[PDB]
Symmetry: C7
Protein backbone atom coordinates (compact mmCIF):
# COMPACT_ATOMS: atom_id res chain seq x y z
CA UNK A 1 0.00 0.00 0.00
CA UNK A 2 1.55 3.21 -1.37
CA UNK A 3 -0.31 6.39 -0.32
CA UNK A 4 -0.85 8.58 -3.34
CA UNK A 5 0.41 12.10 -3.32
CA UNK A 6 -0.16 13.73 0.09
CA UNK A 7 -1.61 10.83 2.06
CA UNK A 8 0.25 8.87 4.67
CA UNK A 9 -0.58 5.43 5.93
CA UNK A 10 -0.61 5.28 9.74
CA UNK A 11 -0.66 2.07 11.74
CA UNK A 12 -3.24 2.50 14.52
CA UNK A 13 -4.15 6.70 27.77
CA UNK A 14 -1.54 6.14 25.08
CA UNK A 15 1.51 3.87 24.87
CA UNK A 16 3.71 6.98 24.80
CA UNK A 17 2.77 8.24 28.18
CA UNK A 18 0.11 10.74 27.07
CA UNK A 19 -3.59 11.10 28.05
CA UNK A 20 -5.90 12.13 25.23
CA UNK A 21 -9.30 13.57 26.28
CA UNK A 22 -7.21 12.05 18.33
CA UNK A 23 -5.24 8.87 18.15
CA UNK A 24 -1.50 8.25 18.20
CA UNK A 25 0.21 5.91 15.73
CA UNK A 26 3.24 5.07 13.67
CA UNK A 27 3.82 6.36 10.16
CA UNK A 28 4.34 3.24 8.04
CA UNK A 29 4.11 4.77 4.54
CA UNK A 30 4.13 8.32 3.12
CA UNK A 31 3.43 9.66 -0.38
CA UNK A 32 5.10 12.04 -2.90
CA UNK A 33 3.17 15.14 -1.92
CA UNK A 34 0.99 17.75 -3.54
CA UNK A 35 2.50 19.13 -6.74
CA UNK A 36 3.00 22.87 -6.81
CA UNK A 37 -0.04 24.67 -8.38
CA UNK A 38 2.49 25.19 -11.19
CA UNK A 39 3.28 21.43 -11.32
CA UNK A 40 7.01 22.31 -11.30
CA UNK A 41 7.75 20.25 -8.12
CA UNK A 42 5.97 18.47 -5.26
CA UNK A 43 5.91 19.78 -1.75
CA UNK A 44 7.44 17.24 0.69
CA UNK A 45 5.78 15.99 3.88
CA UNK A 46 7.43 16.54 7.29
CA UNK A 47 6.73 13.07 8.52
CA UNK A 48 8.70 9.92 7.56
CA UNK A 49 8.25 6.20 8.11
CA UNK A 50 8.63 5.16 11.76
CA UNK A 51 7.60 8.57 12.91
CA UNK A 52 5.26 8.22 15.84
CA UNK A 53 2.55 10.86 15.26
CA UNK A 54 -0.62 12.30 16.80
CA UNK A 55 -3.47 12.85 14.37
CA UNK A 56 -7.20 13.20 14.12
CA UNK A 57 -9.15 10.51 12.22
CA UNK A 58 -11.37 12.86 10.25
CA UNK A 59 -11.68 11.81 6.59
CA UNK A 60 -9.60 8.78 7.47
CA UNK A 61 -10.08 5.52 5.57
CA UNK A 62 -9.47 2.56 7.85
CA UNK A 63 -8.36 -0.70 6.30
CA UNK A 64 -7.20 -3.89 8.15
CA UNK A 65 -4.44 -6.25 6.92
CA UNK A 66 -3.04 -9.43 8.50
CA UNK A 67 -3.91 -8.42 11.97
CA UNK A 68 -3.01 -4.76 11.69
CA UNK A 69 -5.32 -1.84 11.51
CA UNK A 70 -4.26 0.87 9.12
CA UNK A 71 -5.47 4.34 8.32
CA UNK A 72 -4.90 6.21 5.12
CA UNK A 73 -5.13 9.80 6.21
CA UNK A 74 -4.27 13.08 4.58
CA UNK A 75 -1.18 14.92 5.85
CA UNK A 76 -3.42 17.74 6.95
CA UNK A 77 -4.50 15.32 9.81
CA UNK A 78 -1.03 14.76 11.28
CA UNK A 79 -0.64 17.32 14.08
CA UNK A 80 2.59 16.45 15.82
CA UNK A 81 5.35 13.91 16.19
CA UNK A 82 6.48 12.73 19.69
CA UNK B 1 -14.12 5.61 -22.79
CA UNK B 2 -11.37 8.24 -22.36
CA UNK B 3 -11.56 10.09 -19.11
CA UNK B 4 -11.09 13.80 -19.72
CA UNK B 5 -8.34 15.68 -17.89
CA UNK B 6 -7.86 14.46 -14.36
CA UNK B 7 -10.46 11.64 -14.13
CA UNK B 8 -9.51 7.99 -14.17
CA UNK B 9 -11.80 5.09 -15.23
CA UNK B 10 -11.67 2.34 -12.62
CA UNK B 11 -13.16 -1.12 -13.09
CA UNK B 12 -14.98 -2.09 -9.90
CA UNK B 13 -12.83 -8.63 2.20
CA UNK B 14 -10.87 -7.91 -0.97
CA UNK B 15 -9.12 -10.15 -3.54
CA UNK B 16 -5.85 -8.47 -2.54
CA UNK B 17 -5.93 -9.82 1.01
CA UNK B 18 -7.31 -6.68 2.73
CA UNK B 19 -10.43 -6.10 4.91
CA UNK B 20 -12.29 -2.86 4.22
CA UNK B 21 -14.65 -1.83 7.03
CA UNK B 22 -13.83 2.39 0.07
CA UNK B 23 -13.59 -0.07 -2.72
CA UNK B 24 -10.58 -1.52 -4.52
CA UNK B 25 -10.30 -1.80 -8.33
CA UNK B 26 -8.19 -1.73 -11.44
CA UNK B 27 -7.17 1.46 -13.25
CA UNK B 28 -8.41 0.94 -16.83
CA UNK B 29 -8.01 4.43 -18.21
CA UNK B 30 -6.40 7.67 -17.14
CA UNK B 31 -6.70 11.22 -18.41
CA UNK B 32 -4.17 14.05 -19.29
CA UNK B 33 -4.34 15.92 -16.03
CA UNK B 34 -5.38 19.34 -14.85
CA UNK B 35 -3.60 22.10 -16.74
CA UNK B 36 -1.36 24.35 -14.60
CA UNK B 37 -3.33 27.51 -13.49
CA UNK B 38 -1.08 29.16 -16.09
CA UNK B 39 -2.08 26.68 -18.83
CA UNK B 40 1.62 26.04 -19.52
CA UNK B 41 1.57 22.27 -18.92
CA UNK B 42 -0.68 19.66 -17.36
CA UNK B 43 0.00 17.89 -14.09
CA UNK B 44 0.46 14.11 -14.47
CA UNK B 45 -1.48 11.57 -12.37
CA UNK B 46 0.40 8.98 -10.31
CA UNK B 47 -1.66 6.04 -11.36
CA UNK B 48 -1.40 4.26 -14.71
CA UNK B 49 -3.46 1.52 -16.48
CA UNK B 50 -3.28 -1.81 -14.74
CA UNK B 51 -2.72 -0.27 -11.36
CA UNK B 52 -4.72 -1.89 -8.60
CA UNK B 53 -5.97 1.04 -6.40
CA UNK B 54 -8.04 1.78 -3.28
CA UNK B 55 -10.37 4.77 -3.68
CA UNK B 56 -13.59 6.11 -2.35
CA UNK B 57 -16.75 6.17 -4.51
CA UNK B 58 -17.84 9.74 -3.63
CA UNK B 59 -18.78 11.87 -6.72
CA UNK B 60 -18.18 8.75 -8.71
CA UNK B 61 -20.05 8.14 -11.92
CA UNK B 62 -20.75 4.42 -12.36
CA UNK B 63 -21.45 3.13 -15.85
CA UNK B 64 -21.85 -0.49 -16.96
CA UNK B 65 -20.51 -1.88 -20.23
CA UNK B 66 -20.71 -5.49 -21.56
CA UNK B 67 -21.09 -6.99 -18.12
CA UNK B 68 -18.39 -4.91 -16.45
CA UNK B 69 -19.07 -2.17 -13.94
CA UNK B 70 -16.98 0.93 -14.30
CA UNK B 71 -16.53 4.11 -12.38
CA UNK B 72 -15.34 7.44 -13.66
CA UNK B 73 -13.87 9.03 -10.60
CA UNK B 74 -11.58 12.07 -10.11
CA UNK B 75 -7.97 11.49 -9.22
CA UNK B 76 -8.61 13.09 -5.83
CA UNK B 77 -10.50 9.87 -5.01
CA UNK B 78 -7.59 7.40 -5.46
CA UNK B 79 -5.93 6.96 -2.08
CA UNK B 80 -3.35 4.30 -2.59
CA UNK B 81 -2.09 1.53 -4.89
CA UNK B 82 -1.41 -2.01 -3.67
CA UNK C 1 -25.68 29.42 -29.81
CA UNK C 2 -22.04 30.08 -28.95
CA UNK C 3 -20.92 28.85 -25.51
CA UNK C 4 -18.95 31.64 -23.83
CA UNK C 5 -15.46 30.84 -22.61
CA UNK C 6 -15.22 27.34 -21.03
CA UNK C 7 -18.88 26.09 -21.64
CA UNK C 8 -19.79 23.53 -24.22
CA UNK C 9 -23.20 23.07 -25.87
CA UNK C 10 -24.19 19.35 -25.80
CA UNK C 11 -27.06 17.83 -27.64
CA UNK C 12 -28.94 15.38 -25.27
CA UNK C 13 -29.33 2.20 -21.96
CA UNK C 14 -27.47 4.41 -24.46
CA UNK C 15 -27.12 4.40 -28.25
CA UNK C 16 -23.36 3.82 -27.69
CA UNK C 17 -23.85 0.38 -26.04
CA UNK C 18 -23.53 1.62 -22.45
CA UNK C 19 -25.89 1.23 -19.47
CA UNK C 20 -26.08 4.33 -17.19
CA UNK C 21 -27.55 3.71 -13.72
CA UNK C 22 -24.93 10.88 -16.16
CA UNK C 23 -26.16 11.23 -19.66
CA UNK C 24 -24.32 10.71 -22.98
CA UNK C 25 -24.50 13.21 -25.86
CA UNK C 26 -22.83 14.89 -28.83
CA UNK C 27 -20.73 18.05 -28.51
CA UNK C 28 -22.29 20.52 -30.94
CA UNK C 29 -20.39 23.68 -29.94
CA UNK C 30 -17.44 24.56 -27.76
CA UNK C 31 -16.15 27.85 -26.21
CA UNK C 32 -12.70 29.72 -26.25
CA UNK C 33 -11.88 28.69 -22.69
CA UNK C 34 -10.88 30.10 -19.36
CA UNK C 35 -8.36 32.86 -19.66
CA UNK C 36 -5.14 32.10 -17.71
CA UNK C 37 -5.30 33.89 -14.23
CA UNK C 38 -2.75 36.32 -15.68
CA UNK C 39 -5.04 36.90 -18.80
CA UNK C 40 -2.11 36.01 -21.18
CA UNK C 41 -3.86 33.20 -22.99
CA UNK C 42 -6.98 30.94 -22.80
CA UNK C 43 -6.72 27.25 -21.89
CA UNK C 44 -8.25 25.05 -24.66
CA UNK C 45 -10.97 22.38 -24.11
CA UNK C 46 -10.15 18.73 -24.96
CA UNK C 47 -13.47 18.17 -26.62
CA UNK C 48 -14.52 19.45 -30.05
CA UNK C 49 -17.74 19.42 -32.24
CA UNK C 50 -19.07 15.95 -32.89
CA UNK C 51 -17.37 14.38 -30.02
CA UNK C 52 -19.70 11.95 -28.24
CA UNK C 53 -19.19 12.60 -24.50
CA UNK C 54 -20.36 11.34 -21.12
CA UNK C 55 -21.16 14.08 -18.60
CA UNK C 56 -23.21 14.88 -15.56
CA UNK C 57 -26.10 17.42 -15.82
CA UNK C 58 -25.36 19.30 -12.60
CA UNK C 59 -25.52 23.10 -13.14
CA UNK C 60 -26.58 22.37 -16.70
CA UNK C 61 -28.91 24.80 -18.40
CA UNK C 62 -31.29 22.89 -20.62
CA UNK C 63 -32.66 24.73 -23.61
CA UNK C 64 -34.80 23.34 -26.48
CA UNK C 65 -34.55 24.42 -30.11
CA UNK C 66 -36.52 23.15 -33.18
CA UNK C 67 -37.30 19.85 -31.48
CA UNK C 68 -33.86 19.14 -30.15
CA UNK C 69 -32.93 19.41 -26.53
CA UNK C 70 -29.64 21.06 -25.71
CA UNK C 71 -27.56 21.55 -22.65
CA UNK C 72 -25.04 24.29 -22.01
CA UNK C 73 -22.71 22.64 -19.44
CA UNK C 74 -19.30 23.75 -18.11
CA UNK C 75 -16.29 21.79 -19.21
CA UNK C 76 -15.85 20.58 -15.67
CA UNK C 77 -18.95 18.36 -16.44
CA UNK C 78 -17.68 16.43 -19.38
CA UNK C 79 -16.02 13.33 -17.91
CA UNK C 80 -15.07 11.17 -20.89
CA UNK C 81 -15.45 10.79 -24.65
CA UNK C 82 -16.41 7.44 -26.22
CA UNK D 1 -25.79 53.20 -16.40
CA UNK D 2 -22.23 51.99 -16.59
CA UNK D 3 -21.66 48.47 -15.15
CA UNK D 4 -18.68 48.57 -12.87
CA UNK D 5 -15.74 46.25 -13.60
CA UNK D 6 -17.08 42.83 -14.62
CA UNK D 7 -20.88 43.33 -14.68
CA UNK D 8 -22.85 43.82 -17.86
CA UNK D 9 -26.27 45.43 -18.12
CA UNK D 10 -28.72 43.27 -20.04
CA UNK D 11 -32.09 44.41 -21.37
CA UNK D 12 -34.66 41.64 -20.60
CA UNK D 13 -40.69 30.66 -25.40
CA UNK D 14 -38.23 33.38 -26.49
CA UNK D 15 -38.21 36.00 -29.29
CA UNK D 16 -35.12 34.26 -30.72
CA UNK D 17 -36.97 30.99 -31.52
CA UNK D 18 -35.88 29.03 -28.41
CA UNK D 19 -37.82 27.34 -25.56
CA UNK D 20 -36.32 27.76 -22.07
CA UNK D 21 -37.69 25.28 -19.52
CA UNK D 22 -32.46 31.25 -18.00
CA UNK D 23 -33.63 34.18 -19.96
CA UNK D 24 -32.40 35.62 -23.29
CA UNK D 25 -31.68 39.33 -23.84
CA UNK D 26 -29.53 42.02 -25.41
CA UNK D 27 -26.20 43.23 -23.92
CA UNK D 28 -26.79 46.98 -23.54
CA UNK D 29 -23.66 47.92 -21.60
CA UNK D 30 -20.48 46.17 -20.54
CA UNK D 31 -17.87 46.92 -17.83
CA UNK D 32 -13.95 47.18 -17.86
CA UNK D 33 -13.47 43.74 -16.28
CA UNK D 34 -11.81 42.21 -13.23
CA UNK D 35 -8.32 43.54 -12.57
CA UNK D 36 -5.52 40.91 -12.68
CA UNK D 37 -4.83 39.66 -9.08
CA UNK D 38 -1.61 41.57 -9.64
CA UNK D 39 -3.63 44.61 -10.79
CA UNK D 40 -1.36 44.93 -13.91
CA UNK D 41 -4.28 44.77 -16.33
CA UNK D 42 -8.01 43.91 -16.47
CA UNK D 43 -9.40 40.86 -18.10
CA UNK D 44 -11.76 41.61 -21.03
CA UNK D 45 -15.27 40.24 -21.29
CA UNK D 46 -16.28 38.29 -24.39
CA UNK D 47 -19.55 40.00 -24.87
CA UNK D 48 -20.11 43.53 -26.24
CA UNK D 49 -23.10 45.89 -26.68
CA UNK D 50 -25.79 44.47 -28.93
CA UNK D 51 -24.83 40.94 -28.33
CA UNK D 52 -27.91 38.77 -27.88
CA UNK D 53 -27.01 36.43 -24.98
CA UNK D 54 -28.46 33.61 -22.86
CA UNK D 55 -27.84 33.92 -19.10
CA UNK D 56 -29.10 32.97 -15.76
CA UNK D 57 -30.82 35.54 -13.40
CA UNK D 58 -29.07 34.44 -10.20
CA UNK D 59 -27.57 37.35 -8.15
CA UNK D 60 -29.08 39.60 -10.79
CA UNK D 61 -30.20 43.14 -9.89
CA UNK D 62 -33.22 44.13 -11.89
CA UNK D 63 -33.97 47.83 -12.35
CA UNK D 64 -36.63 49.42 -14.63
CA UNK D 65 -36.06 52.61 -16.65
CA UNK D 66 -38.46 54.40 -19.01
CA UNK D 67 -40.49 51.24 -19.60
CA UNK D 68 -37.58 48.93 -20.17
CA UNK D 69 -36.57 46.25 -17.72
CA UNK D 70 -32.88 45.87 -17.17
CA UNK D 71 -30.63 43.54 -15.28
CA UNK D 72 -27.13 44.19 -14.00
CA UNK D 73 -25.65 40.70 -13.85
CA UNK D 74 -22.09 39.48 -13.45
CA UNK D 75 -20.24 38.23 -16.46
CA UNK D 76 -20.15 34.74 -14.88
CA UNK D 77 -23.87 34.56 -15.61
CA UNK D 78 -23.71 35.01 -19.40
CA UNK D 79 -23.62 31.48 -20.84
CA UNK D 80 -23.71 31.78 -24.59
CA UNK D 81 -24.42 34.35 -27.33
CA UNK D 82 -26.80 33.53 -30.21
CA UNK E 1 -14.97 59.55 8.04
CA UNK E 2 -12.28 57.99 5.85
CA UNK E 3 -13.09 54.54 4.47
CA UNK E 4 -10.15 52.27 5.01
CA UNK E 5 -8.71 50.56 1.91
CA UNK E 6 -11.40 49.38 -0.42
CA UNK E 7 -14.51 50.70 1.33
CA UNK E 8 -16.42 53.67 0.02
CA UNK E 9 -18.72 55.91 2.12
CA UNK E 10 -22.01 56.43 0.32
CA UNK E 11 -24.66 58.96 1.26
CA UNK E 12 -28.13 57.21 1.02
CA UNK E 13 -38.66 55.21 -7.34
CA UNK E 14 -35.32 57.09 -7.30
CA UNK E 15 -34.36 60.70 -7.84
CA UNK E 16 -32.38 59.71 -10.96
CA UNK E 17 -35.35 58.55 -12.96
CA UNK E 18 -35.13 54.81 -12.19
CA UNK E 19 -37.51 52.26 -10.52
CA UNK E 20 -35.85 49.64 -8.23
CA UNK E 21 -37.93 46.51 -7.48
CA UNK E 22 -30.48 48.02 -4.47
CA UNK E 23 -30.47 51.60 -3.44
CA UNK E 24 -28.94 54.61 -5.32
CA UNK E 25 -26.74 57.22 -3.67
CA UNK E 26 -23.75 59.56 -3.88
CA UNK E 27 -20.15 58.52 -3.24
CA UNK E 28 -19.01 60.89 -0.53
CA UNK E 29 -15.62 59.25 0.32
CA UNK E 30 -13.52 56.51 -1.23
CA UNK E 31 -10.55 54.59 0.21
CA UNK E 32 -6.99 53.62 -1.02
CA UNK E 33 -7.90 50.16 -2.26
CA UNK E 34 -6.76 46.66 -1.75
CA UNK E 35 -2.99 46.15 -1.80
CA UNK E 36 -1.83 43.75 -4.48
CA UNK E 37 -1.30 40.25 -2.88
CA UNK E 38 2.39 41.11 -3.31
CA UNK E 39 1.98 44.40 -1.48
CA UNK E 40 3.69 46.29 -4.30
CA UNK E 41 0.83 48.69 -5.01
CA UNK E 42 -2.86 49.21 -4.32
CA UNK E 43 -5.60 48.57 -6.93
CA UNK E 44 -7.69 51.71 -7.52
CA UNK E 45 -11.48 51.91 -7.24
CA UNK E 46 -13.53 52.98 -10.27
CA UNK E 47 -15.81 55.33 -8.31
CA UNK E 48 -14.80 58.84 -7.09
CA UNK E 49 -16.51 61.41 -4.89
CA UNK E 50 -19.64 62.83 -6.35
CA UNK E 51 -20.33 59.74 -8.38
CA UNK E 52 -23.94 58.80 -8.19
CA UNK E 53 -23.90 54.93 -7.87
CA UNK E 54 -26.27 51.99 -7.61
CA UNK E 55 -25.27 49.41 -4.98
CA UNK E 56 -26.65 46.70 -2.78
CA UNK E 57 -26.76 47.14 1.01
CA UNK E 58 -25.41 43.66 1.91
CA UNK E 59 -22.70 43.82 4.58
CA UNK E 60 -23.16 47.55 4.64
CA UNK E 61 -22.69 49.46 7.90
CA UNK E 62 -25.17 52.33 8.13
CA UNK E 63 -24.24 55.29 10.30
CA UNK E 64 -26.17 58.60 10.72
CA UNK E 65 -24.37 61.99 11.10
CA UNK E 66 -25.98 65.48 11.37
CA UNK E 67 -29.27 64.39 9.76
CA UNK E 68 -27.68 62.48 6.91
CA UNK E 69 -27.69 58.75 6.54
CA UNK E 70 -24.44 57.19 5.38
CA UNK E 71 -23.31 53.76 4.47
CA UNK E 72 -19.81 52.34 4.58
CA UNK E 73 -19.97 49.59 1.95
CA UNK E 74 -17.28 47.53 0.20
CA UNK E 75 -16.50 48.37 -3.41
CA UNK E 76 -17.66 44.91 -4.43
CA UNK E 77 -21.21 46.26 -3.66
CA UNK E 78 -21.24 49.17 -6.10
CA UNK E 79 -22.75 47.85 -9.31
CA UNK E 80 -22.86 50.85 -11.63
CA UNK E 81 -22.71 54.64 -11.86
CA UNK E 82 -25.46 56.71 -13.52
CA UNK F 1 -0.63 43.13 24.79
CA UNK F 2 0.89 43.04 21.29
CA UNK F 3 -1.57 42.09 18.47
CA UNK F 4 0.01 39.47 16.35
CA UNK F 5 0.40 40.08 12.60
CA UNK F 6 -2.71 41.81 11.15
CA UNK F 7 -4.79 42.22 14.38
CA UNK F 8 -5.18 45.56 16.07
CA UNK F 9 -6.14 46.19 19.70
CA UNK F 10 -8.92 48.72 19.96
CA UNK F 11 -10.10 50.33 23.23
CA UNK F 12 -13.91 50.25 23.30
CA UNK F 13 -24.77 57.76 20.15
CA UNK F 14 -20.96 58.06 20.02
CA UNK F 15 -18.52 60.60 21.61
CA UNK F 16 -17.53 61.66 18.08
CA UNK F 17 -21.01 63.03 17.26
CA UNK F 18 -22.23 60.02 15.22
CA UNK F 19 -25.30 57.76 15.69
CA UNK F 20 -24.77 54.03 15.11
CA UNK F 21 -27.92 52.00 14.48
CA UNK F 22 -20.65 48.88 14.79
CA UNK F 23 -18.85 50.52 17.61
CA UNK F 24 -16.32 53.43 17.48
CA UNK F 25 -13.08 53.45 19.44
CA UNK F 26 -9.38 54.19 19.71
CA UNK F 27 -6.56 52.18 18.19
CA UNK F 28 -4.26 51.37 21.15
CA UNK F 29 -1.99 48.73 19.47
CA UNK F 30 -1.40 47.52 15.94
CA UNK F 31 0.35 44.41 14.59
CA UNK F 32 3.12 43.87 11.89
CA UNK F 33 0.68 42.65 9.23
CA UNK F 34 0.15 39.63 6.99
CA UNK F 35 3.19 38.35 5.29
CA UNK F 36 3.03 38.43 1.49
CA UNK F 37 1.91 34.92 0.24
CA UNK F 38 5.61 34.77 -0.89
CA UNK F 39 6.78 35.71 2.64
CA UNK F 40 9.01 38.50 1.18
CA UNK F 41 7.55 41.26 3.20
CA UNK F 42 4.51 42.10 5.32
CA UNK F 43 1.66 44.34 4.32
CA UNK F 44 1.28 47.37 6.58
CA UNK F 45 -2.01 48.33 8.19
CA UNK F 46 -3.51 51.79 7.52
CA UNK F 47 -4.41 52.66 11.06
CA UNK F 48 -1.96 53.52 13.86
CA UNK F 49 -2.09 54.04 17.59
CA UNK F 50 -4.41 56.84 18.63
CA UNK F 51 -6.48 56.56 15.56
CA UNK F 52 -10.14 56.80 16.43
CA UNK F 53 -11.84 54.14 14.29
CA UNK F 54 -15.31 52.73 13.36
CA UNK F 55 -15.37 48.94 13.21
CA UNK F 56 -17.67 45.98 13.54
CA UNK F 57 -17.27 43.58 16.51
CA UNK F 58 -17.64 40.32 14.52
CA UNK F 59 -14.95 37.74 15.45
CA UNK F 60 -13.78 40.22 18.04
CA UNK F 61 -12.16 38.92 21.19
CA UNK F 62 -13.06 41.12 24.12
CA UNK F 63 -10.69 41.29 27.10
CA UNK F 64 -10.79 43.73 30.06
CA UNK F 65 -7.76 45.10 31.86
CA UNK F 66 -7.60 47.51 34.81
CA UNK F 67 -11.13 48.83 34.18
CA UNK F 68 -10.76 49.30 30.44
CA UNK F 69 -12.47 47.11 27.92
CA UNK F 70 -10.42 46.06 24.96
CA UNK F 71 -10.99 44.26 21.72
CA UNK F 72 -8.50 42.39 19.60
CA UNK F 73 -10.04 42.49 16.10
CA UNK F 74 -8.62 41.78 12.70
CA UNK F 75 -7.85 44.68 10.47
CA UNK F 76 -10.64 43.48 8.14
CA UNK F 77 -13.05 44.80 10.75
CA UNK F 78 -11.81 48.43 10.85
CA UNK F 79 -13.98 50.30 8.35
CA UNK F 80 -13.03 53.93 8.63
CA UNK F 81 -11.11 56.45 10.83
CA UNK F 82 -12.71 59.74 11.96
CA UNK G 1 5.80 16.74 21.04
CA UNK G 2 6.81 18.55 17.84
CA UNK G 3 3.92 20.58 16.21
CA UNK G 4 3.97 19.83 12.57
CA UNK G 5 4.20 22.77 10.13
CA UNK G 6 2.12 25.72 11.42
CA UNK G 7 0.76 24.46 14.76
CA UNK G 8 2.25 25.47 18.05
CA UNK G 9 1.96 23.58 21.38
CA UNK G 10 0.68 25.84 24.14
CA UNK G 11 0.67 25.08 27.81
CA UNK G 12 -2.75 25.95 29.32
CA UNK G 13 -9.50 36.01 35.53
CA UNK G 14 -5.96 35.26 34.35
CA UNK G 15 -2.58 35.06 36.19
CA UNK G 16 -1.38 37.95 33.98
CA UNK G 17 -3.81 40.45 35.45
CA UNK G 18 -6.48 40.28 32.72
CA UNK G 19 -10.21 39.38 32.68
CA UNK G 20 -11.45 37.23 29.78
CA UNK G 21 -15.26 37.27 29.33
CA UNK G 22 -9.96 32.94 24.91
CA UNK G 23 -7.42 31.56 27.26
CA UNK G 24 -3.83 32.71 27.93
CA UNK G 25 -0.82 30.42 28.18
CA UNK G 26 2.82 29.75 27.32
CA UNK G 27 4.15 28.77 23.91
CA UNK G 28 6.04 25.50 24.64
CA UNK G 29 6.80 24.40 21.06
CA UNK G 30 6.48 25.85 17.56
CA UNK G 31 6.29 24.29 14.03
CA UNK G 32 8.26 25.13 10.75
CA UNK G 33 5.34 27.04 9.18
CA UNK G 34 3.24 26.65 6.13
CA UNK G 35 5.25 26.06 2.99
CA UNK G 36 4.85 28.82 0.36
CA UNK G 37 2.15 27.78 -2.22
CA UNK G 38 5.14 27.39 -4.52
CA UNK G 39 6.90 25.27 -1.86
CA UNK G 40 10.06 27.42 -2.19
CA UNK G 41 10.21 28.22 1.47
CA UNK G 42 8.08 28.07 4.66
CA UNK G 43 6.55 31.15 6.20
CA UNK G 44 7.77 31.72 9.78
CA UNK G 45 5.56 32.11 12.86
CA UNK G 46 5.67 35.20 15.03
CA UNK G 47 5.55 33.41 18.37
CA UNK G 48 8.50 31.51 19.93
CA UNK G 49 8.89 29.17 22.98
CA UNK G 50 8.28 30.98 26.25
CA UNK G 51 6.04 33.56 24.67
CA UNK G 52 2.99 34.02 26.85
CA UNK G 53 0.17 34.36 24.28
CA UNK G 54 -3.58 34.99 24.15
CA UNK G 55 -5.45 32.55 21.83
CA UNK G 56 -8.84 30.96 21.22
CA UNK G 57 -9.38 27.20 21.76
CA UNK G 58 -11.35 26.58 18.52
CA UNK G 59 -10.02 23.57 16.61
CA UNK G 60 -7.62 22.99 19.43
CA UNK G 61 -6.58 19.47 20.39
CA UNK G 62 -6.09 19.20 24.13
CA UNK G 63 -3.67 16.55 25.37
CA UNK G 64 -2.47 16.03 28.94
CA UNK G 65 1.09 14.84 29.87
CA UNK G 66 2.63 14.25 33.34
CA UNK G 67 0.03 16.51 34.99
CA UNK G 68 0.28 19.39 32.54
CA UNK G 69 -2.41 20.27 30.11
CA UNK G 70 -1.35 21.12 26.59
CA UNK G 71 -3.04 22.33 23.43
CA UNK G 72 -1.92 21.87 19.88
CA UNK G 73 -3.64 24.83 18.14
CA UNK G 74 -2.89 26.37 14.77
CA UNK G 75 -1.07 29.69 14.56
CA UNK G 76 -4.28 31.32 13.22
CA UNK G 77 -5.56 30.91 16.86
CA UNK G 78 -2.78 33.01 18.53
CA UNK G 79 -4.07 36.54 18.75
CA UNK G 80 -1.50 38.41 20.79
CA UNK G 81 1.58 38.14 23.09
CA UNK G 82 1.72 39.86 26.45
Amino acid sequence: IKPLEDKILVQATTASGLVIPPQEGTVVAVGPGRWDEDGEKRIPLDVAEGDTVIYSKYGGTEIKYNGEEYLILSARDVLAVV
